[PDB]
Design a binder for this molecule. Structure first.
Ligand SMILES: Nc1ncnc2c1ncn2[C@@H]1O[C@H](COP(=O)(O)OP(=O)(O)O)[C@@H](O)[C@H]1O
Ligand SMILES: Nc1ncnc2c1ncn2[C@@H]1O[C@H](COP(=O)(O)OP(=O)(O)O)[C@@H](O)[C@H]1O
Ligand SMILES: OC[C@H]1O[C@H](O)[C@H](O)[C@@H](O)[C@@H]1O
Ligand SMILES: OC[C@H]1O[C@H](O)[C@H](O)[C@@H](O)[C@@H]1O
Length: 898
C-alpha cells in the first residue's frame, strides 16, 4: 500500500480522472469541428483530412491486388485476392522487408528507391510482374488528398524523416522510383492511411464499422463523416471517411495543463519537437521512453535503486514499450521487471520491481484513458450525426500496443464505455492488417479509374488543338476561294452566294416597310418604320405565327398560302390599309439570286421539306400565293438571307460591321466581299454581301478527320443525311442530339443512370438545346441538373448530373471553337484582302443558342482572337432581329429602282 500510494502521489498528474477525461473529450470535440470548418481549417491542429473513401466494403469487390504497407513498425508487401474464387472471401500472402534507420532518415529518393526495389523483389519471387495487379498503398502519415490516387505528404511523424518528401505527392515519387528501375510496371491506384485500411478491413466483416483506430507506433483515428459537415469537399451528398490525425491534438498548446515534465522532455529530444504532442503521451514509440525518463528522475532523488544510476539507464530508448508490456503481465510481471532492470546495470531490489511496475501501469493506463477520451468525442459526433438516443457502432482497431500489452485494451475499452454510456460499442481487432482493407479501396478505385479512362478517351475525340483549329480555318478559307471563283464555283461545297446587297446603310433610308422572317425558330411578319435626318428613328412591330411541321414539310402551295394567310392577319392586326407596301422577305435557306428580288431555292436545310419549292423562285412562289388569295397586293422588293439581314441591322449603327453571323437553329455567315473577287457576278466595282452558306462546309469530306462517331450518327439519322455537316457540329438543332448519343453510349457502358436506357432517353429531340444552356450553368447541388434530367425522365445521382454537365460542355465548347475557326477565316480574308496590318471589324450576330448559352459566345470570341490575332473583332448581338436590316435592304431596293 505505501510504495504505490507514494508513486501515485509522485505521478499524480499522469493519473487522470473522469472529469478531466470528459474535459479532454470536449476539447477534442471542438478541434474536430475546427478541422472540418473552411474558416478554421488552415489553423486547425486536428486536420480532419478527407480520404475520398466514401463507403465501407459492400461485397461487390473482387480482384487480385498488391498492397504496400509503410509507416508502422514493419514495411509489408501483400498480394490480396478477394472473392477471386468461390467460397474464399479473401486470400492473402505477405512479406516483411527490413528497412533500416538510414533509409528512413535519409533522402526521399533513397526511401522510394527502397520501396520500388522491395516491390520488384516481391513481384519477381511470385512471378506476377505481368499480371497488371492494381496496387494499393497504405502510407501512415498525414496527407493532402484531392483524389484517391494522390497523397501529398503534409508532415513526417513517428520515426520517418526523409528529405524532399514533405509537400510532394508520394504517388509521383513512388512512380518516379519505379520508372527509374525500368524493371516492371506498377499501377498505383489508391493511397490510404492505416486508420482507413483498418476501418475497411473490419468493415468487410462488420457492416456497422464506422471507425478505424490505430494504437501502434503512432496513434490516430478515422471515422465516417457526413459530406454536409465536410466544408472542404464539394457536395452535401452522403458520407466520407475523415482521417482525424488526432496525434497533433494539443500542438497549439491546448493540452499544456495535462502535459508533465516527462512529456516535455520526450518531446524536446524527439525527431519532431513540438508536434504530435497528444500522440507522444499515448503510443508505443513513446511510452517506454516516458517510463525511462521517470525512472531516471526517481533514481536521481534516491527513490529507486538506492540512487544507483547507470549510463544504460541514462540511454534514450533503452527501455521500450515491450518492456512496459512485459512488466505489466499478471503472473510474470515482477519477474520480468527484475530481469529487465538487472540488465539496466542496476541491481534492482524487489521493492524496486514493484515501484517500476506501478510506474509502467500509470503510464500505460494514462495512454488508454486519453485515447478513450478522444475516441469518445468521435462516438458522440457519430451519435449526433445519426440523430438517435443510442449509438451502435463498431470500431476496428490495430497497432502493436493495443494488440500486445496484457492490460491496455481491457482498460481502454472500460474507460471508453464509461465515458460514452449512450453507446453500444463493439471493438473488432483487425487481425489481417491494413492490406485487406487497402485492397477493398483499391478494387473500387480501379473500377472507377477504368470508367474514367474510357469516358476521357471518348470525349478526347471532341478536343480540338490550336493547330487543328488553324487547319479548319485554313480549309474554310480554301473553300471560300473555291466558291467565289467561276472555274470552281459549281462543285464548291461552300457556295459563296451573291446577295445583291452592295453597301451597308448610308443613313438616308426612310419609309414604311413590311418584312417576313422565315426559317429560324419563329416565323414572323413585321412592320418597320424608318426615319432619317436630325434624329433618325426605327419603329418596329411584329407578330409570331406558328408553322406546323406538316406545312413545313407539305407542298409549296400550302406553305406559301400559310405565309399569305399570316400576312393577311398581321395587316388586320396593325390596321394597315392604303396603297400596296414594299416588302422584304428574309428567307433563311440557300438561294441562287440573279437580283435582289429573285432567288431560286437551291436545297432545303434545317427542318423544311415542302415540295415543288427547290428550283423555283421563292419570290414567284410568294407572288403566286398573294394572287391566289386575291385580297391585298404587295411589292416584294427583296429576298434576303438572315445572315445578311443581321449584318445590315448591326451596320445601321456601326460602320465597321461588315460581317453577319447566325448561330440558332442552323449556322451560317455573310460578309462584304470585293466585286473583283465575286467572279460569278459581272462587274469589278464596289462590294457585294456574300451569303456563304457555310453550313455545308465538310459536305465534300473536308472535316472527316474531326467528325466523330456521334457526328456521323446525328447526320445519318437527320432529314438531310450527308448535308450541312459543319452546321450539324455547331447549331441549335443539332448539339442536343450529339449529347444524347454520347449519353446513350455511356449508359450502355454502365457509366450513367445505372445502365438504364429510359424510353425517354431513346426519344430523339428530348435533349433540347433549351436544356443545354440550363444544364451548363448550375447549382452546386446540381439540383438544377436533376429536375432537367428527371422532368424528361431519368434519375440522376449527383455523379450522374456531373457527367451529363461535362458532356454538354465538351460539345458546346467544340461547337464554339469550330464556329470561331470559320469566323477567323472570314475576318482574316477581309483584312488580308484590304492590305491591312490590323483590322477592326464588327460582326452582327443572332440566334438562340448564341444568345442563351452561357459559354458559347465567350469561347467563340476567344477562339477568333487566338486564330486571327491581327484582327480585333467586336461581336454585336442584334436586339431587333433581322427585321430592321431587311427593311433597310428593302429601302435601298426601292431607291435603286430610281
Ligand atoms: N486513472 C488511472 N490512471 C492511472 N492509473 C490508474 C488509474 N486508475 C487506476 N490506475 C491503476 O491501475 C491499476 C488498476 O488496474 P485495473 O485495470 O482496474 O485492475 P487490474 O489490477 O485487474 O488491472 C492500479 O495499478 C491503479 O493504481
Ligand atoms: N437555352 C438554350 N441554349 C441554347 N440553345 C438554345 C436554347 N434554347 C433554345 N436554343 C436553340 O435555339 C434555336 C433557335 O434559334 P433561332 O434559329 O435563331 O430561332 P428564333 O430566334 O426565331 O427563335 C433552336 O435550334 C434551339 O434548339
Ligand atoms: O500509424 C499511426 C498514425 O501514426 C501517426 O500519428 C500518423 O500521423 C498517422 O498518419 C497514423 O495514422
Ligand atoms: O438560319 C441560319 C442558316 O440556316 C442554314 O444554314 C440555312 O442554309 C442558311 O440559309 C441560314 O442562314
Amino acid at each position: 500500500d505505501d510504495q504505490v500510494k507514494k508513486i501515485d502521489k509522485y505521478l499524480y498528474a499522469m493519473r487522470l480522472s473522469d472529469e478531466t477525461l470528459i474535459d479532454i473529450m470536449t476539447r477534442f470535440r471542438k478541434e474536430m469541428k475546427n478541422g472540418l470548418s473552411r474558416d478554421f481549417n488552415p489553423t486547425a491542429t486536428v486536420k480532419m483530412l478527407p480520404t475520398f473513401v466514401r463507403s465501407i466494403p459492400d461485397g461487390s469487390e473482387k480482384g487480385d491486388f498488391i498492397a504496400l504497407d509503410l509507416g508502422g513498425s514493419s514495411f509489408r508487401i501483400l498480394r490480396v485476392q478477394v472473392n477471386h474464387e468461390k467460397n474464399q472471401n479473401v486470400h492473402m500472402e505477405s512479406e516483411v522487408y527490413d528497412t533500416p534507420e538510414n533509409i528512413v532518415h535519409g533522402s526521399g529518393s533513397q526511401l522510394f528507391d527502397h520501396v520500388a526495389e522491395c516491390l520488384g523483389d516481391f513481384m519477381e519471387k511470385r512471378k506476377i510482374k505481368d499480371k497488371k495487379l492494381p496496387v494499393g498503398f497504405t502510407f501512415s502519415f498525414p496527407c493532402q488528398q484531392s483524389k484517391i490516387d494522390e497523397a501529398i505528404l503534409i508532415t513526417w511523424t513517428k520515426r520517418f524523416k526523409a528529405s524532399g518528401v514533405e509537400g510532394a505527392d508520394v504517388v509521383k515519387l513512388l512512380n518516379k522510383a519505379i520508372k527509374k528501375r525500368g524493371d516492371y510496371d506498377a499501377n498505383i491506384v489508391a493511397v490510404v492511411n492505416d486508420t482507413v485500411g483498418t476501418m475497411m478491413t473490419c468493415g468487410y466483416d462488420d457492416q456497422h464499422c464506422e471507425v478505424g483506430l490505430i494504437i501502434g507506433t503512432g496513434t490516430n483515428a478515422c471515422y465516417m463523416e457526413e459530406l454536409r459537415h465536410i466544408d472542404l469537399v464539394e457536395g452535401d451528398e452522403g458520407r466520407m471517411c475523415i482521417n482525424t490525425e488526432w496525434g497533433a491534438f494539443g500542438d497549439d498548446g491546448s493540452l499544456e495543463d495535462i502535459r508533465t515534465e516527462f512529456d516535455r522532455a520526450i518531446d524536446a529530444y524527439s525527431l519532431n519537437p513540438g508536434k504530435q504532442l497528444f500522440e507522444k503521451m499515448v503510443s508505443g514509440m513513446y511510452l517506454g521512453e516516458l517510463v525511462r525518463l521517470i525512472l531516471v528522475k526517481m533514481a536521481k532523488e534516491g527513490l529507486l535503486f538506492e540512487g544507483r544510476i547507470t549510463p544504460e539507464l541514462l540511454t534514450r530508448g533503452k527501455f521500450n514499450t515491450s518492456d512496459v508490456s512485459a512488466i505489466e503481465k499478471n503472473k510474470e510481471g515482477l519477474h520480468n521487471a527484475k530481469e529487465i532492470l538487472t540488465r539496466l546495470g542496476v541491481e534492482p531490489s524487489d521493492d524496486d520491481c514493484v515501484s517500476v511496475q506501478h510506474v509502467c501501469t500509470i503510464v500505460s493506463f494514462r495512454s488508454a484513458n486519453l485515447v478513450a477520451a478522444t475516441l469518445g468525442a468521435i462516438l458522440n459526433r457519430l451519435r449526433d450525426n445519426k440523430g438517435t438516443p443510442r449509438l451502435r457502432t463498431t470500431v476496428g482497431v490495430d497497432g502493436s500496443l493495443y494488440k500486445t500489452h496484457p492490460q491496455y485494451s481491457r482498460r481502454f475499452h472500460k474507460t471508453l464505455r464509461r465515458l460514452v454510456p449512450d453507446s453500444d460499442v463493439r471493438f473488432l481487432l483487425s487481425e489481417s492488417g491494413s492490406g485487406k482493407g487497402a485492397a477493398m479501396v483499391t478494387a473500387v478505385a480501379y473500377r472507377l479509374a477504368e470508367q474514367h479512362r474510357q469516358i476521357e478517351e471518348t470525349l478526347a475525340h471532341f478536343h480540338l488543338t490550336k493547330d487543328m483549329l488553324l487547319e479548319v480555318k485554313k480549309r474554310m478559307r480554301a473553300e471560300m476561294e473555291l466558291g467565289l471563283r467561276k472555274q470552281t464555283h459549281n462543285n464548291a461545297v461552300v457556295k459563296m452566294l451573291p446577295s445583291f446587297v452592295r453597301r451597308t446603310p448610308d443613313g438616308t433610308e426612310n419609309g414604311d416597310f413590311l418584312a417576313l422572317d422565315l426559317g429560324g425558330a419563329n416565323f414572323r411578319v413585321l412592320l418597320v418604320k424608318i426615319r432619317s435626318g436630325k434624329k433618325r428613328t426605327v419603329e418596329m412591330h411584329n407578330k409570331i405565327y406558328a408553322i406546323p411541321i406538316e406545312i413545313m414539310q407539305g407542298t409549296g402551295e400550302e406553305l406559301f398560302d400559310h405565309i399569305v394567310s399570316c400576312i393577311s392577319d398581321f395587316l388586320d392586326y396593325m390596321g394597315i390599309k392604303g396603297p400596296r407596301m414594299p416588302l422584304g422577305f428574309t428567307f433563311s435557306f440557300p438561294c441562287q439570286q440573279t437580283s435582289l428580288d429573285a432567288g431560286i431555292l437551291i436545297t432545303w436545310t434545317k427542318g423544311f421539306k415542302a415540295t415543288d419549292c427547290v428550283g423555283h423562285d421563292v419570290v414567284t412562289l410568294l407572288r403566286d400565293a398573294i394572287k391566289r388569295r386575291e385580297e391585298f397586293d404587295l411589292d416584294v422588293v427583296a429576298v434576303v438571307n438572315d445572315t445578311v439581314g443581321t449584318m445590315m441591322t448591326c451596320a445601321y449603327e456601326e460602320p465597321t460591321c461588315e460581317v453577319g453571323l447566325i448561330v440558332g437553329t442552323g449556322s451560317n455567315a455573310c460578309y462584304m466581299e470585293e466585286m473583283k473577287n465575286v467572279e460569278m457576278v459581272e462587274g469589278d466595282q464596289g462590294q457585294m454581301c456574300i451569303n456563304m452558306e457555310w453550313g455545308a462546309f465538310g459536305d465534300n469530306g473536308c472535316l472527316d478527320d474531326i467528325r466523330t462517331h456521334y457526328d456521323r450518327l446525328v447526320d445519318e439519322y437527320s432529314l438531310n443525311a450527308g448535308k450541312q455537316r459543319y452546321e450539324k457540329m455547331i447549331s441549335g438543332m443539332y448539339l442536343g442530339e450529339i449529347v444524347r448519343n454520347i449519353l446513350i453510349d455511356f449508359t450502355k457502358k454502365g457509366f450513367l443512370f445505372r445502365g438504364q436506357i429510359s424510353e425517354t432517353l431513346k426519344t430523339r429531340g428530348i435533349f433540347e438545346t433549351k436544356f443545354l444552356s440550363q444544364i451548363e450553368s448550375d447549382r452546386l447541388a446540381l439540383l438544377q441538373v436533376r429536375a432537367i434530367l428527371q422532368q424528361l425522365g431519368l434519375n440522376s445521382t449527383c455523379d450522374d448530373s456531373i457527367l451529363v454537365k461535362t458532356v454538354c460542355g465538351v460539345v458546346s465548347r467544340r461547337a464554339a471553337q469550330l464556329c470561331g475557326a470559320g469566323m477567323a477565316a472570314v475576318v482574316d480574308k477581309i483584312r488580308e484582302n484590304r492590305g491591312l496590318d490590323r483590322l477592326n471589324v464588327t460582326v452582327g450576330v443572332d440566334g438562340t443558342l448564341y444568345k442563351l448559352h452561357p459559354h458559347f459566345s465567350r469561347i467563340m470570341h476567344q477562339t477568333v482572337k487566338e486564330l486571327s490575332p491581327k484582327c480585333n473583332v467586336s461581336f454585336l448581338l442584334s436586339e431587333d432581329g433581322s427585321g430592321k436590316g431587311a427593311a433597310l435592304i428593302t429601302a435601298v431596293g426601292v431607291r435603286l429602282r430610281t
